[PDB]
Design a protein around this ligand. Structure first.
Ligand SMILES: *[C@@H]1O[C@H](CO)[C@@H](O)[C@H](O)[C@H]1NC(C)=O
Lengths: 50, 50
């Protein structure tokens, strides 16, 4: 026997983050939860109170 | 009847013009034609980690 995983793709919008060497380090889905939608609008990973 | 399809402003690919090449000059206001990309400026040695 063996093991292998399978998923599927969908059209989404992401917020990729590049470091100083040009390599992707983190990303945020823009349609997962209310908090993630705020980050995409502000285009920042840190949200102040308000 | 002969038909043909084109595509522009993409990744640098083949099927290009027959113009002759030239040399490289640095630290001088010069025009460049790097495989479709057109403009003017001052070319200098970079240090980005592509
Ligand atoms: C970027 O690359 C330089 C040299 O390769 C290295 O010194 C530096 O730690 C790197 N920065 C990272 C991986 O965040």
């Amino acid at each position: 026997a063996a093991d292998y995983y399978v998923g599927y793709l969908q059209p989404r919008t992401f917020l990729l983050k590049y470091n100083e060497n040009g390599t992707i380090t983190d990303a945020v889905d823009c349609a997962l939860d209310p908090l993630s939608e705020t980050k995409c609008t502000l285009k920042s990973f840190t949200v102040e109170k308000g | 009847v002969v038909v043909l399809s084109f595509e522009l402003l993409h990744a640098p690919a083949t099927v290009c013009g027959p113009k002759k090449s030239t040399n490289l000059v640095k630290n001088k206001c010069v025009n460049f034609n790097f495989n479709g990309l057109t403009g003017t400026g001052v070319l200098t040695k970079s240090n980005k980690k592509f």
